[PDB]
Amino acid sequence: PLIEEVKLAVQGLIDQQMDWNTIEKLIKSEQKKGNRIAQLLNLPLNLKQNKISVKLDLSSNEKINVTIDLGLSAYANATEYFNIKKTSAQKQKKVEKNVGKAMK
Amino acid sequence: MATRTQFENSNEIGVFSKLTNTYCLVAVGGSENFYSAFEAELGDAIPIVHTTIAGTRIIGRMTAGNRRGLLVPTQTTDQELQHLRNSLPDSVKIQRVEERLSALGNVICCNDYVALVHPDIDRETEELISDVLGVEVFRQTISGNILVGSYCSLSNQGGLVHPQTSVQDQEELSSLLQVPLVAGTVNRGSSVVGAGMVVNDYLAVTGLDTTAPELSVIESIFRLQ
Amino acid sequence: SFGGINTFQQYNTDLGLGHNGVRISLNYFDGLPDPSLLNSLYSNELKLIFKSLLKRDETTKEKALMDLSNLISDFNQNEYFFNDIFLLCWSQIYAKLIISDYKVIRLQSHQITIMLVKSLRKKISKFLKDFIPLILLGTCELDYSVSKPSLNELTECFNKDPAKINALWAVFQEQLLNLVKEIVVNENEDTISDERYSSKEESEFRYHRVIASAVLLLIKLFVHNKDVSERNSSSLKVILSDESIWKLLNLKNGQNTNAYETVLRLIDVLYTRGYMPSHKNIMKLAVKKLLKSLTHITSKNILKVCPVLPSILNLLATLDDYEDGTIWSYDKSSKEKVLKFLSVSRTSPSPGFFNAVFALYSSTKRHSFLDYYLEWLPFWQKSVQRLNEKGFSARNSAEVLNEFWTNFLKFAEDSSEERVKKMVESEIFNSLSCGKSLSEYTKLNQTLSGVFPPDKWEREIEDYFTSD
Amino acid sequence: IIEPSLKALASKYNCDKSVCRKCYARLPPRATNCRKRKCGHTNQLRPKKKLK
Amino acid sequence: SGNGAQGTKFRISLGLPVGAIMNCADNSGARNLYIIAVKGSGSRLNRLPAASLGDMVMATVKKGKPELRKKVMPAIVVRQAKSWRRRDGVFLYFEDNAGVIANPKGEMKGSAITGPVGKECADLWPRVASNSGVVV
RNA sequence: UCAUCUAGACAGCCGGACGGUGGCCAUGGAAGUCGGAAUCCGCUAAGGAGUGUGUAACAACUCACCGGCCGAAUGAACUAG
RNA sequence: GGGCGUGUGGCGUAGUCGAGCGCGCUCCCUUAGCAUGGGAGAGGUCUCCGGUUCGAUUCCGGACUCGUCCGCCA
Ligand SMILES: [Mg+2]
Ligand SMILES: [Zn+2]
């Protein structure tokens, strides 16, 4: 849900037809003034590919940086990361089928 | 203010306008923004005259102006001369000049007190300048540039000169004119500063492509704050 | 027509300058009018005016302001147009406009607000708290052209009553202070001006001009309100502590010493109030910066910095009195800085420079800051010699020489030594004799009324006639 | 932004059409054949390409 | 002319066809300009594209400094020497063909102009009028 | 050549379009609708272990089926003048 | 213009889908010269870019580049 709040915030700033660098400066100023929604964001924004990046706590003090598409839901981005996981497994099985004949 | 203005796209305002303390002259073929800049900044205290000199839209390079007097070339017609006589206040004196170089804005760089001229002007024209303008005259070149009006912008407070000017020439001209001078550029690096802009005691008007450091140099040397 | 939501702003809940529920701020990025309010405006014409004001290009902004003014001028027909919604939106945009580089934009915006107050009197009461501080900041802007008209209009708005103008300073003083704090502490050069469209310099220049206005306002606020220090001490401390006001005291670079002068006035005013004495840290920070400024003056910039020098010395003399020359003690090298400053300063003399130097001497003599004979006299003698050679070539020279003599004569009196007496006589003779045309300038001769007993001067005249 | 209902009303006339693949004619959205003679009243139609 | 024109120009009698060599009036170190093209000229079978006063041309420096030779550059005609009529009906002409060097936007490569220039050229190009000594 | 048809057909409106059951595998999830197989009953006038939209999965909407109005022919595929 | 082939280290050149040698010179040792020789060096985006593969110089498609061959009239 908090990722959806961050997405709604960035999309509301986008829908004002505001300049991207002014949006990044607004994110920096609100991070300095201690807004949580701003402080969850990482500043090199990929608005050219409609993608933001967000910091999530690994343990419920280390934070991980995850890229979120603005045109899909947060659950839909999670399903994309699951899909990239699932495609990686099939290539690994193809490698395991390769190993014996290749090394022979 | 150094006010950003264009003459229909032209970033050279000194070519198409002549600004003194007492009056202003603008070309007849001008845009609404170009007239509105002088009308808003100058106000109703100072007359603005839409004029043509010798059938040409260029008036700043054709004429040399002062608060006491105005100099016009020989080719200026009687209708234009009478219109300037009616539109101008009674204080200023308008006198035709009969001289071969005939482009008085290029030839003469002048202010209220002291003037720089082309070295090769005629002695009768020098005495005519000293009479009508009431201004002491020096024949000098700005680092070998004979067109002192085109290559210098001068006011009472200070002056802007050509960028490629020798420093020794800078203190020599500064001591000769009794004003501080700065070498600088106008209109995104154009060398012709006097053609680039017009200035007086409280206003400077320049082209739109004049950058912010150039505008800061303008307001610093002309003390417009 | 207007789309989007300022979701980020809702979380913040800081209204900056504004007290009516809309954030009003100088920075370009935030404080922009909310899209929903913009739609709520009464007429389409008004909405278009707002979009144009938002656009960066100046010609477009100016055209929109001209249109808005025309609408306000025809107030009777358009009274319905200007509602609370218009005023809330205007207030947010006005703040950005007053910091604009272009003077016309600044002037027009100020004129427009004043017109609104006159026309909508008693209905702008809710918004007076937002508008009044900004209007005043404009009236205390360094440029004469923006300030003078604005003040005249304000006075006219209040029916030419001096009391009302003064009252305004008193009534909104807390708010006026908040504006100053915001410029000084909250803002930075980058926040005020966009980096992409401006250089490292210019951005600095702009910030400095805006901050100077804030300081001028602060000085005015202090003068107008006697009790300001006590009521707003916490706010005052934060503004004063920040180095931004003090960074203005740099003479190495910068177009004018006018901003630097404004800071000097503030330090003096604070000392008179006793705030600087009361809070030691603020005073020490200010003093150290002032000492650093003395080093900045150099031969290259001496002509540029000459008008401000009499003022600098005068402030120093007043500060020295505090704490028995405690100000010199703060810096280990202060004496060296002063000596260097004096050496650079003497070469170019400006009117009132000598009086300042004597004042410094008067404060320092009790605590022996400068050796009278080894250190001070050399300074005096060299000075007269310099004055004579370039003499009386400049205009006001007559006044400058007169000053030297009056001051030196006083300095000499506190010597009781032969060398000083000898120097005075010899120098006087040299100054009169090489001279220029001292007698010819009657005023100069009058101002320099005499330097010695009357009969002796006659004996010297006798020698000139008797000479070969 | 126009308005959502007004964008719907304008897109009813400007965007919710079909295009004949042979002669590029702008056609009713529920049409089955092109109304033009030069393509021979063909039934090769496609939806008009939307944005987004 | 074309792009850098400040206003329009009345028709001046064309005096400089392709292949004409004119004097180089400015102080850029070039001696003559050789006209290879006229900007804005029309198309007719066998007709040479000709230039008049105030026109912008494409030219090569045939004689002058070697860093100016062997390349094409824009030029502006300032003296015509073929007599043309004004709308006040005086027929006038200079005694030589002369032009200056410029970029495609029209600002001068040089800094000063020797000899007279025409007012029909000075009105149309402001940089030429800026560096021009006498305008007739 | 197949089908439907005064025991009410095809268009157009309006209403329902349900339970066992979130059927079995498989997935971090997939409940009619990512796929693999099966694809059966009840209540019925009638409703697919689903025609699409559809959500992370739901939820929701619509279908092909049955009903009121209409009262009489109509739908699909193909052939050749 | 088209056709046909071609492309590897600083230089030359070898490669079955599992980048090597020589030379130039990087260094050191070797020596009565008419100065050699020995030992360890580095070095490629396999012309480039895609796809197949598990991996392509190794297979293929495209592009680039060079070499060849054949071409107008009265
Ligand atoms: Mg031919
Ligand atoms: Zn068709």
Curated annotation (Swiss-Prot), chain B:
The keyword Nucleus applies. The modification Phosphoserine is found at residues 174-175. The keyword Hydrolase does not apply. GO terms for cellular component: cytoplasm; cytosol; nucleolus; nucleus; preribosome, large subunit precursor. GO terms for biological process: assembly of large subunit precursor of preribosome; cytosolic ribosome assembly; maturation of 5.8S rRNA; maturation of 5.8S rRNA from tricistronic rRNA transcript (SSU-rRNA, 5.8S rRNA, LSU-rRNA); maturation of LSU-rRNA; maturation of LSU-rRNA from tricistronic rRNA transcript (SSU-rRNA, 5.8S rRNA, LSU-rRNA); ribosomal large subunit biogenesis; ribosomal subunit export from nucleus. NCBIfam families: eIF-6. Monomer. Associates with the 60S ribosomal subunit. Binds to the 60S ribosomal subunit and prevents its association with the 40S ribosomal subunit to form the 80S initiation complex in the cytoplasm. Is also involved in ribosome biogenesis. Associates with pre-60S subunits in the nucleus and is involved in its nuclear export. Cytoplasmic release of TIF6 from 60S subunits and nuclear relocalization is promoted by the GTPase RIA1/EFL1 and by SDO1. Also required for pre-rRNA processing. This is Eukaryotic translation initiation factor 6. It comes from Saccharomyces cerevisiae (strain ATCC 204508 / S288c) (Baker's yeast). The gene is TIF6.
Curated annotation (Swiss-Prot), chain C:
Its main location: nucleus. Present with 222 molecules/cell in log phase SD medium. GO terms for molecular function: ribosomal large subunit binding; ubiquitin protein ligase activity; ubiquitin-protein transferase activity; zinc ion binding. One of its GO terms (cellular component) is cytosolic ribosome. Keywords: Cytoplasm, Metal-binding, Nucleus, Repeat, Transferase, Ubl conjugation pathway, Zinc, Zinc-finger. HEAT repeats lie at residues 40-77, 126-163, 174-216, 261-300, 303-347. The lineage of its organism: Eukaryota, Fungi, Dikarya, Ascomycota, Saccharomycotina. Changing residue 60 to A: Reduced binding to stalled 60S ribosomal subunits. One of its GO terms (biological process) is subtelomeric heterochromatin formation. It is found in: Nucleus; Cytoplasm, Cytosol. Component of the ribosome quality control complex (RQC), composed of the E3 ubiquitin ligase RKR1/LTN1, RQC1 and RQC2, as well as CDC48 and its ubiquitin-binding cofactors associated with the 60S ribosomal subunits. It comes from the Eukaryota. This is E3 ubiquitin-protein ligase listerin. Belongs to the LTN1 family.
Curated annotation (Swiss-Prot), chain D:
Component of the ribosome, a large ribonucleoprotein complex responsible for the synthesis of proteins in the cell. The small ribosomal subunit (SSU) binds messenger RNAs (mRNAs) and translates the encoded message by selecting cognate aminoacyl-transfer RNA (tRNA) molecules. The large subunit (LSU) contains the ribosomal catalytic site termed the peptidyl transferase center (PTC), which catalyzes the formation of peptide bonds, thereby polymerizing the amino acids delivered by tRNAs into a polypeptide chain. This is Large ribosomal subunit protein eL40A. Component of the large ribosomal subunit (LSU). Mature yeast ribosomes consist of a small (40S) and a large (60S) subunit. The 40S small subunit contains 1 molecule of ribosomal RNA (18S rRNA) and 33 different proteins (encoded by 57 genes). The large 60S subunit contains 3 rRNA molecules (25S, 5.8S and 5S rRNA) and 46 different proteins (encoded by 81 genes). It comes from Saccharomyces cerevisiae (strain ATCC 204508 / S288c). There is a cross-link at residue 17 (Glycyl lysine isopeptide (Lys-Gly) (interchain with G-Cter in ubiquitin)). Signal peptide: none annotated. It is found in: Cytoplasm.
UniProtKB/Swiss-Prot annotation, chain E:
GO terms for cellular component: cytosol; cytosolic large ribosomal subunit. Keywords: Acetylation, Cytoplasm, Methylation, Ribonucleoprotein, Ribosomal protein. CDD domains: Ribosomal_uL14 (cd00337). It is found in: Cytoplasm. The keyword Metal-binding does not apply. GO terms for biological process: cytoplasmic translation. Pfam families: Ribosomal_L14. Methylated by RKM1 at 2 different sites, but it is unclear which are the 2 methylated residues among Lys-39, Lys-105 and/or Lys-109. SMART domains: Ribosomal_L14. GO terms for molecular function: large ribosomal subunit rRNA binding; structural constituent of ribosome. The modification N6,N6-dimethyllysine is found at residues 105, 109. The modification N-acetylserine is found at residue 1. It comes from the Eukaryota. Gene3D superfamilies: Ribosomal protein L14. PROSITE patterns: RIBOSOMAL_L14. Signal peptide: none annotated. There are 2 genes for uL14 in yeast. Component of the large ribosomal subunit (LSU). Mature yeast ribosomes consist of a small (40S) and a large (60S) subunit. The 40S small subunit contains 1 molecule of ribosomal RNA (18S rRNA) and 33 different proteins (encoded by 57 genes). The large 60S subunit contains 3 rRNA molecules (25S, 5.8S and 5S rRNA) and 46 different proteins (encoded by 81 genes). Belongs to the universal ribosomal protein uL14 family. This is Large ribosomal subunit protein uL14A. The gene is RPL23A.
